[PDB]
Design an enzyme around this catalytic site. Structure first.
Site, PDB file in Angstrom:
ATOM      1  N   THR A 159       0.810  -1.166   0.056  1.00 56.72           N
ATOM      2  CA  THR A 159       0.164   0.063  -0.015  1.00 56.72           C
ATOM      3  C   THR A 159       0.770   1.361  -0.086  1.00 56.72           C
ATOM      4  N   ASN A 180       5.759  -1.575   3.807  1.00 56.72           N
ATOM      5  CA  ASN A 180       4.843  -1.331   4.521  1.00 56.72           C
ATOM      6  C   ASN A 180       5.490  -1.045   6.086  1.00 56.72           C
ATOM      7  N   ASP A 261      -9.658  -3.427  -0.795  1.00 59.55           N
ATOM      8  CA  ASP A 261      -8.652  -4.270  -0.007  1.00 59.55           C
ATOM      9  C   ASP A 261      -8.821  -4.843   1.370  1.00 59.55           C
ATOM     10  N   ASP A 681      26.778  -2.597 -13.352  1.00 61.94           N
ATOM     11  CA  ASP A 681      26.048  -1.899 -12.257  1.00 61.94           C
ATOM     12  C   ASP A 681      26.529  -2.301 -10.961  1.00 61.94           C
ATOM     13  N   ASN A 683      27.377  -1.062  -8.260  1.00 65.60           N
ATOM     14  CA  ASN A 683      26.798  -0.422  -7.154  1.00 65.60           C
ATOM     15  C   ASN A 683      25.014  -0.508  -7.146  1.00 65.60           C
ATOM     16  N   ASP A 685      22.601   0.575  -8.660  1.00 68.58           N
ATOM     17  CA  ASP A 685      21.675   1.804  -8.552  1.00 68.58           C
ATOM     18  C   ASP A 685      20.876   2.181  -9.788  1.00 68.58           C
ATOM     19  N   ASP A 689      27.513   2.483 -14.555  1.00 68.32           N
ATOM     20  CA  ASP A 689      28.891   2.540 -14.008  1.00 68.32           C
ATOM     21  C   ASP A 689      30.150   3.304 -14.861  1.00 68.32           C
TER      22      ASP A 689
HETATM   23  C1  LIG Z   1      14.924   7.595 -10.494  1.00 63.60           C
HETATM   24  O1  LIG Z   1      14.581   8.978 -10.568  1.00 63.60           O
HETATM   25  C2  LIG Z   1      15.362   9.700  -9.564  1.00 63.60           C
HETATM   26  C3  LIG Z   1      15.087  11.225  -9.476  1.00 63.60           C
HETATM   27  O2  LIG Z   1      15.707  11.742 -10.470  1.00 63.60           O
HETATM   28  C4  LIG Z   1      16.688   9.214  -9.488  1.00 63.60           C
HETATM   29  O3  LIG Z   1      17.282   9.607  -8.097  1.00 63.60           O
HETATM   30  C5  LIG Z   1      18.438  10.615  -8.235  1.00 63.60           C
HETATM   31  O4  LIG Z   1      19.519  10.017  -8.629  1.00 63.60           O
HETATM   32  C6  LIG Z   1      20.773  11.266  -8.822  1.00 63.60           C
HETATM   33  C7  LIG Z   1      21.994  10.431  -9.221  1.00 63.60           C
HETATM   34  O5  LIG Z   1      22.405   9.383  -8.360  1.00 63.60           O
HETATM   35  C8  LIG Z   1      20.786  11.805  -7.085  1.00 63.60           C
HETATM   36  O6  LIG Z   1      21.766  12.585  -7.414  1.00 63.60           O
HETATM   37  C9  LIG Z   1      22.679  12.929  -6.277  1.00 63.60           C
HETATM   38  O7  LIG Z   1      22.205  13.702  -5.174  1.00 63.60           O
HETATM   39  C10 LIG Z   1      22.987  14.171  -4.333  1.00 63.60           C
HETATM   40  C11 LIG Z   1      22.194  14.792  -3.357  1.00 63.60           C
HETATM   41  O8  LIG Z   1      20.745  14.322  -3.046  1.00 63.60           O
HETATM   42  C12 LIG Z   1      20.118  15.003  -2.171  1.00 63.60           C
HETATM   43  O9  LIG Z   1      19.272  16.311  -2.567  1.00 63.60           O
HETATM   44  C13 LIG Z   1      18.329  15.604  -3.715  1.00 63.60           C
HETATM   45  C14 LIG Z   1      17.361  17.002  -4.194  1.00 63.60           C
HETATM   46  O10 LIG Z   1      16.455  17.438  -3.069  1.00 63.60           O
HETATM   47  C15 LIG Z   1      17.423  14.703  -2.915  1.00 63.60           C
HETATM   48  O11 LIG Z   1      16.436  14.359  -3.797  1.00 63.60           O
HETATM   49  C16 LIG Z   1      18.089  13.569  -2.415  1.00 63.60           C
HETATM   50  O12 LIG Z   1      17.034  12.729  -1.701  1.00 63.60           O
HETATM   51  C17 LIG Z   1      17.682  11.453  -1.415  1.00 63.60           C
HETATM   52  O13 LIG Z   1      18.056  11.125  -0.253  1.00 63.60           O
HETATM   53  C18 LIG Z   1      17.610  11.278   0.860  1.00 63.60           C
HETATM   54  C19 LIG Z   1      18.300  11.410   2.419  1.00 63.60           C
HETATM   55  O14 LIG Z   1      18.954  10.338   2.360  1.00 63.60           O
HETATM   56  C20 LIG Z   1      16.021  10.364   0.784  1.00 63.60           C
HETATM   57  O15 LIG Z   1      15.167  10.942   1.632  1.00 63.60           O
HETATM   58  C21 LIG Z   1      15.731  10.375  -0.383  1.00 63.60           C
HETATM   59  O16 LIG Z   1      14.551   9.227  -0.643  1.00 63.60           O
HETATM   60  C22 LIG Z   1      16.819  10.149  -1.751  1.00 63.60           C
HETATM   61  O17 LIG Z   1      17.133   8.889  -1.515  1.00 63.60           O
HETATM   62  C23 LIG Z   1      17.660   8.217  -2.588  1.00 63.60           C
HETATM   63  O18 LIG Z   1      18.808   8.805  -3.415  1.00 63.60           O
HETATM   64  C24 LIG Z   1      19.904   8.717  -2.469  1.00 63.60           C
HETATM   65  C25 LIG Z   1      21.021   9.216  -3.646  1.00 63.60           C
HETATM   66  O19 LIG Z   1      21.023  10.741  -3.449  1.00 63.60           O
HETATM   67  C26 LIG Z   1      20.350   7.104  -2.336  1.00 63.60           C
HETATM   68  O20 LIG Z   1      21.550   7.056  -1.418  1.00 63.60           O
HETATM   69  C27 LIG Z   1      18.941   6.425  -1.431  1.00 63.60           C
HETATM   70  O21 LIG Z   1      19.480   5.113  -1.378  1.00 63.60           O
HETATM   71  C28 LIG Z   1      17.895   6.789  -2.108  1.00 63.60           C
HETATM   72  O22 LIG Z   1      17.862   5.740  -3.368  1.00 63.60           O
HETATM   73  C29 LIG Z   1      18.994  14.025  -1.453  1.00 63.60           C
HETATM   74  O23 LIG Z   1      18.593  14.469  -0.153  1.00 63.60           O
HETATM   75  C30 LIG Z   1      24.159  14.634  -4.353  1.00 63.60           C
HETATM   76  O24 LIG Z   1      24.900  14.752  -3.268  1.00 63.60           O
HETATM   77  C31 LIG Z   1      25.064  13.548  -5.455  1.00 63.60           C
HETATM   78  O25 LIG Z   1      26.181  13.932  -5.818  1.00 63.60           O
HETATM   79  C32 LIG Z   1      27.261  13.242  -5.642  1.00 63.60           C
HETATM   80  O26 LIG Z   1      27.776  12.296  -6.487  1.00 63.60           O
HETATM   81  C33 LIG Z   1      27.889  12.962  -7.939  1.00 63.60           C
HETATM   82  C34 LIG Z   1      28.278  12.041  -8.871  1.00 63.60           C
HETATM   83  O27 LIG Z   1      27.714  12.806 -10.085  1.00 63.60           O
HETATM   84  C35 LIG Z   1      29.110  14.007  -7.580  1.00 63.60           C
HETATM   85  O28 LIG Z   1      29.124  15.019  -8.968  1.00 63.60           O
HETATM   86  C36 LIG Z   1      29.078  14.775  -6.179  1.00 63.60           C
HETATM   87  O29 LIG Z   1      30.078  15.407  -6.141  1.00 63.60           O
HETATM   88  C37 LIG Z   1      28.497  14.228  -4.967  1.00 63.60           C
HETATM   89  O30 LIG Z   1      29.732  12.932  -4.897  1.00 63.60           O
HETATM   90  C38 LIG Z   1      29.919  13.409  -3.435  1.00 63.60           C
HETATM   91  O31 LIG Z   1      29.164  12.542  -2.618  1.00 63.60           O
HETATM   92  C39 LIG Z   1      29.449  11.335  -2.804  1.00 63.60           C
HETATM   93  C40 LIG Z   1      28.349  10.116  -1.815  1.00 63.60           C
HETATM   94  O32 LIG Z   1      28.292  10.874  -0.694  1.00 63.60           O
HETATM   95  C41 LIG Z   1      30.767  10.750  -2.471  1.00 63.60           C
HETATM   96  O33 LIG Z   1      30.899   9.468  -2.584  1.00 63.60           O
HETATM   97  C42 LIG Z   1      31.662  11.570  -3.128  1.00 63.60           C
HETATM   98  O34 LIG Z   1      33.070  11.508  -2.774  1.00 63.60           O
HETATM   99  C43 LIG Z   1      31.451  13.122  -3.175  1.00 63.60           C
HETATM  100  O35 LIG Z   1      31.778  13.668  -1.851  1.00 63.60           O
HETATM  101  C44 LIG Z   1      24.150  13.148  -6.477  1.00 63.60           C
HETATM  102  O36 LIG Z   1      24.118  14.032  -7.632  1.00 63.60           O
HETATM  103  C45 LIG Z   1      19.584  12.127  -6.905  1.00 63.60           C
HETATM  104  O37 LIG Z   1      19.618  12.567  -5.302  1.00 63.60           O
HETATM  105  C46 LIG Z   1      18.485  11.123  -6.807  1.00 63.60           C
HETATM  106  N1  LIG Z   1      17.201  11.444  -6.341  1.00 63.60           N
HETATM  107  C47 LIG Z   1      16.408  10.917  -5.632  1.00 63.60           C
HETATM  108  C48 LIG Z   1      14.866  11.640  -5.339  1.00 63.60           C
HETATM  109  O38 LIG Z   1      16.412   9.792  -5.406  1.00 63.60           O
HETATM  110  C49 LIG Z   1      17.209   7.829  -9.788  1.00 63.60           C
HETATM  111  O39 LIG Z   1      18.303   7.753 -10.225  1.00 63.60           O
HETATM  112  C50 LIG Z   1      15.986   7.196 -10.938  1.00 63.60           C
HETATM  113  N2  LIG Z   1      16.354   6.010 -11.132  1.00 63.60           N
HETATM  114  C51 LIG Z   1      16.651   5.087 -12.132  1.00 63.60           C
HETATM  115  C52 LIG Z   1      17.056   3.793 -12.164  1.00 63.60           C
HETATM  116  O40 LIG Z   1      16.852   5.844 -13.328  1.00 63.60           O
HETATM  117 CA   LIG Z   2      25.709   1.843 -11.412  1.00 62.05          CA
HETATM  118 CL   LIG Z   3       6.863  -4.545   3.564  1.00 62.35          CL
HETATM  119 ZN   LIG Z   4      -3.991  -4.701   1.631  1.00 54.35          ZN
END
Ligand SMILES: *[C@@H]1O[C@H](CO)[C@@H](O[C@@H]2O[C@H](CO)[C@@H](O[C@@H]3O[C@H](CO[C@H]4O[C@H](CO)[C@@H](O)[C@H](O[C@H]5O[C@H](CO)[C@@H](O)[C@H](O)[C@@H]5O[C@H]5O[C@H](CO)[C@@H](O)[C@H](O)[C@@H]5O)[C@@H]4O)[C@@H](O)[C@H](O[C@H]4O[C@H](CO)[C@@H](O)[C@H](O)[C@@H]4O[C@H]4O[C@H](CO)[C@@H](O)[C@H](O)[C@@H]4O)[C@@H]3O)[C@H](O)[C@H]2NC(C)=O)[C@H](O)[C@H]1NC(C)=O
Ligand SMILES: [Ca+2]
Ligand SMILES: [Cl-]
Ligand SMILES: [Zn+2]
Ligand SMILES: O=C(c1ccc2[nH]nnc2c1)N1C[C@@H]2[C@H](C1)[C@H]1CN(C(=O)c3cc4ccccc4c(OCC(F)(F)F)n3)C[C@@H]21
Ligand SMILES: [Ca+2]
Ligand code: NA
Length: 804
Positions: A159, A180, A261, A681, A683, A685, A689
């Site tokens: 859900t 959930n 449901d 891939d 990592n 994600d 890669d």
């Molecule tokens: C589906 O669509 C979505 C949305 O478009 C895609 O997800 C995006 O992927 C992007 C690329 O990976 C990613 O961009 C990164 O963002 C970092 C900043 O993120 C914060 O701000 C944004 C904007 O508001 C926000 O959305 C983020 O929210 C995430 O995290 C919070 C708190 O944890 C969660 O509440 C939320 O659910 C969300 O989590 C998800 O994403 C994160 C990754 O961000 C995962 O870890 C979680 O598991 C979960 O899946 C954040 O609040 C930014 O910092 C990154 O930049 C780093 O890496 C780049 C590489 O290009 C580099 O240029 C930078 O210098 C930086 O590197 C530094 O940090 C590294 C890591 O700490 C470190 O190793 C290095 O050494 C450096 O110090 C990066 O740009 C974006 O955040 C997400 N957005 C969302 C909403 O998920 C997704 O990919 C699509 N899926 C597919 C399969 O296509």
């Molecule tokens: Ca990857």
């Molecule tokens: Cl569950």
């Molecule tokens: Zn149900």
């Protein structure tokens, strides 16, 4: 602590939540236990029921009534929904013939057609056909509007993951609501259905539709409803909001139904007790539509009727117990049910080993009803790995079954006959979509699509720019009469080199050997290496490279490839196999033949010695030698630039695909075009890669080992035309096969590949879009089709389920 001293007087269902310390009057205050003392009295009036009766007509207003039948009710916005029918001679909406809504017919002062999202929990897709007799309002929406035969939920088909996917356009792994029930190890906090922790903002990622709307100046109704607020009151509240002054009135609204449901869990999806909940939902849709009609809004509002997931038959007796498998059962924590997630009970237990748990759970019983995976080995189509809240060990549970830790959990925590949560390609988990209104098409059926696409469309309906999300914007343009979103193809970032013959055989010291040995035929072979047959094998243009890299286009008689100088192998190989093509064998003298490619430097080539030394790793080819067009063209297939690293266990899978299945698809589909390649891939994600993310190389070399191999198989939708001369829409199936050193995933793998390989491939079915994210490539650049139609084709998933 709440100062329930305040009053709800004139604040009933207030749209902005009042600041503490004040008692709340919004539709969620019940759930926070923070309503004002008089909330029930003023806001949840029930007196006299929900319907006008003949004698109530033109009554004097009595503020105690649940709804009104006085003369002023229409301009007050609070008539019972059947008022104009009972008192003014009007018809119910369901009794009116439908008429195309060509443009929005809105009252003066409406700046856009409002959007109403009518969400129904557990509404299985087959209910639309199977329940049609008792759902006349819903049936009218469906046949007069735009509908899909079904809509695919996200995994897990629970859900909260699905409602929040609907709201954000994100996979659960990205929005963070991965079940959930969840444990976040960084917070050291737990998320449960019961309880208060789930209200903490830190669980909820991405940007839901109500927030997107607010930030761009579009007001939202509050989407969530306390369970005790009756459905009739929810509908009356939305209709009242729709009567607010222009500056105060929201443009987007949600209604939610806990049914079907709630009953589906108790009685199973088709229990005879299920008819009533379906009748009652329909009655509610009818009250909404009658109510809109009274407000002259029934041809102004866009209505989405949408489910979160279906419902399957599941009973106590179909439970697998981990205590039958693991000796160490008390050292694990299991998130149980229609999926399993396992982690160590204690982080201080150094004797915890996931490899031994996995092995103890692998193919242990003949008809075993779950399968263990490390999360990075789950089918990539599930996109269920890239979150710290998803445990390393996952159990994919067969439909109709549960997994539990110990028997005591099941009898000391039968009752239920239905549940959901299974793999999102399972037919019983499919749900519904209908769009009705001025912006949706008239009497139109669209193909099944995934719920991740809806956020974009809802943004389109409200003139909003969507936050970044996993939908493919434009892929659902065909649902809409206008407000379509016209994207441009992404720009190619890297241009290829077209290398000629530049190296002599002797410059290569690769440890490779091959037993290989007329101006008519020599002008011919030169033409083929320049691209003379490229039109046959590259049907939709070359894929564009959407990142910065160095690569070469290589042409051959039977195939064309984009060869990476960085990864030392093709990013993609493209070939066409006509219905008439013949399968041949690798001649005995050519069994271990690998040939240097004189167009590509030794320094950018693989070598055979690395494979010889790497005792675990063997190699295969992307264009298969079996499919060569002639004995002479066969030599091209043994080029070192067509070679890729392959575990012998995987070669079993790959060989069967190439020797048996490609020809089979070509015969069934009237020719196929195939694009295959590697995926890295490490990592998990779901994204390509970079070179520095690679965790495994062929021993002693810089040949990176792929995590997966993909293929995209395209033909003509009208199979009376051959794949290479197709005038209209295309048809596609694709896969992303995990490149594993064992076949532990396939319990029958000791048998002949004809008994297990196709089943493995079906499980790893994929959308072209999934492959695009994983490779940084963009396919179908040069077709004669509209770009939106191609976006739709790229989001297609071949599921291999039978008819819904
Ligand atoms: C589906 O669509 C979505 C949305 O478009 C895609 O997800 C995006 O992927 C992007 C690329 O990976 C990613 O961009 C990164 O963002 C970092 C900043 O993120 C914060 O701000 C944004 C904007 O508001 C926000 O959305 C983020 O929210 C995430 O995290 C919070 C708190 O944890 C969660 O509440 C939320 O659910 C969300 O989590 C998800 O994403 C994160 C990754 O961000 C995962 O870890 C979680 O598991 C979960 O899946 C954040 O609040 C930014 O910092 C990154 O930049 C780093 O890496 C780049 C590489 O290009 C580099 O240029 C930078 O210098 C930086 O590197 C530094 O940090 C590294 C890591 O700490 C470190 O190793 C290095 O050494 C450096 O110090 C990066 O740009 C974006 O955040 C997400 N957005 C969302 C909403 O998920 C997704 O990919 C699509 N899926 C597919 C399969 O296509
Ligand atoms: Ca990857
Ligand atoms: Cl569950
Ligand atoms: Zn149900
Ligand atoms: O305890 C359960 C539950 C229900 C069925 C179950 N089956 N198996 N286990 C179950 C557990 N709940 C009760 C809560 C939540 C699920 C449902 C969402 N609700 C909205 O008003 C509501 C309506 C919405 C309408 C459209 C879009 C989003 C909506 C939203 O969002 C919920 C989210 F944001 F958290 F994702 N919430 C109230 C209901
Ligand atoms: Ca080897
Ligand atoms: Na096996």
């Amino acid at each position: 602590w709440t100062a329930t001293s305040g009053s709800c007087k004139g604040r009933c269902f207030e749209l902005q939540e009042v600041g503490p310390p004040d008692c709340r009057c919004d539709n969620l205050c019940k759930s926070y236990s923070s309503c004002c003392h008089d909330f029930d009295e003023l806001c949840l009036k029930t007196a006299r029921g929900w319907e006008c009766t003949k004698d109530r007509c033109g009554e004097v207003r009595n503020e105690e009534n649940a709804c009104h039948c006085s003369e002023d009710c229409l301009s007050r916005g609070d008539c019972c929904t059947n008022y104009q029918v009972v008192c003014k001679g009007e018809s119910h909406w369901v009794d009116d013939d439908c008429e195309e809504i060509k443009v929005p017919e809105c009252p003066a002062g409406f700046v856009r057609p409002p959007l109403i999202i009518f969400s129904v929990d557990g509404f299985r897709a087959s209910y639309m056909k199977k329940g049609s007799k008792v759902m006349p309002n819903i049936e009218k929406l469906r046949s007069c509007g735009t509908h899909a035969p079904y809509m695919r939920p996200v995994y897990p088909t629970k859900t909260f993951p699905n409602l929040y996917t609907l709201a954000t356009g994100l996979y659960p792994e990205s929005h963070g609501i991965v079940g959930n029930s969840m444990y976040d190890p960084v917070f050291d906090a737990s998320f449960h259905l019961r309880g208060r922790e789930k209200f903490n903002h830190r669980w909820w990622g991405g940007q839901p539709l109500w927030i997107t709307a607010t930030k761009q100046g579009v007001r939202a109704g509050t989407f969530f409803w306390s369970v005790s607020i009756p459905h009739e009151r929810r509908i009356l509240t939305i209709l009242q909001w729709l009567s607010l002054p222009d500056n105060e009135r929201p443009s987007v609204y949600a209604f939610y139904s806990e049914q079907p449901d709630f009953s589906g869990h108790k009685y199973g999806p088709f229990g005879p007790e299920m008819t009533n909940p379906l009748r009652e939902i329909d009655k509610t849709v009818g009250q909404l539509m009658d109510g809109l009609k009274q407000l002259r809004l029934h041809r102004c509002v866009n209505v989405i009727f949408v489910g979160d997931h279906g419902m399957e038959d599941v009973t106590c007796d179909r439970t697998e117990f981990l205590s039958n498998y693991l000796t160490n059962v008390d050292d694990i924590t299991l998130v149980p049910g229609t999926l399993g997630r396992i982690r160590a009970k204690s982080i201080n237990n150094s004797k915890y080993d996931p490899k031994t748990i996995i092995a103890a759970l692998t193919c242990k019983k003949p008809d075993q009803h779950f399968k263990p995976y490390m999360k990075q080995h789950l089918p990539k189509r599930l996109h269920y790995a890239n979150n710290r809240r998803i445990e390393d060990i996952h159990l994919l549970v067969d439909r109709r079954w549960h997994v539990a830790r110990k028997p005591l959990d099941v009898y000391k925590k039968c009752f239920f006959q239905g549940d959901h949560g299974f793999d999102n390609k399972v037919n019983s988990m499919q749900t519904v979509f209908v769009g009705y209104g001025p912006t949706f098409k008239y009497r139109t059926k669209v193909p099944p699509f995934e719920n991740i696409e809806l956020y974009n469309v809802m943004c389109d309906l409200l003139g909003l720019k969507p936050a970044p999300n996993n939908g493919t914007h434009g892929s659902l343009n065909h649902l809409l009469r206008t407000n379509t979103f016209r994207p441009t193809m992404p720009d190619e970032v890297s241009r290829p080199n077209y290398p000629g013959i530049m190296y002599l055989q002797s410059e290569f010291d690769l440890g490779c050997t091959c037993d290989d040995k007329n101006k008519l035929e020599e002008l011919n072979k030169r033409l083929h290496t320049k691209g003379s047959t490229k039109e046959r094998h590259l049907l939709y243009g070359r894929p564009a490279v959407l990142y910065r890299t160095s690569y070469d286009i290589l042409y051959h008689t039977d195939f064309e490839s984009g060869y990476s100088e960085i990864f030392l192998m093709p990013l993609w190989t493209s070939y066409t196999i006509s219905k008439q093509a013949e399968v041949s064998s690798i001649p005995e003298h050519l069994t271990n033949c690998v040939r240097p490619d004189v167009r590509v430097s030794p320094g950018f080539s693989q070598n055979c010695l690395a494979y010889k030394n790497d005792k675990q790793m063997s190699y295969g080819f992307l264009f298969p030698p079996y499919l060569s067009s002639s004995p002479e063209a066969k030599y091209d297939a043994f080029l070192v630039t067509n070679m890729v690293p392959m575990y012998p266990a995987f070669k079993r899978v790959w060989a069967y695909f190439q020797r048996v299945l490609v020809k089979k698809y070509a015969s069934e589909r009237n020719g196929v075009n195939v694009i295959s390649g590697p995926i890295f891939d490490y990592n998990y994600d779901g994204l390509r890669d970079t070179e520095d993310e690679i965790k495994q190389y062929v021993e002693g070399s810089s040949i990176p080992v792929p995590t997966h191999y993909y293929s995209i198989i395209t033909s003509c939708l009208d199979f009376t035309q051959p794949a290479d001369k197709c005038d209209g829409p295309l048809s596609v199936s694709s896969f992303i096969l995990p490149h594993r050193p064992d076949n532990d995933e396939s319990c029958n793998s000791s048998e002949d590949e004809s008994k297990w390989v196709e089943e493995l491939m079906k499980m790893h079915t994929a959308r072209v879009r999934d492959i695009e994210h994983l490779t940084g490539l963009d396919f179908y650049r040069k077709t004669s089709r509209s770009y939106s139609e191609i976006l739709t084709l790229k989001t297609y998933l071949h599921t291999y389920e039978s008819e819904i």
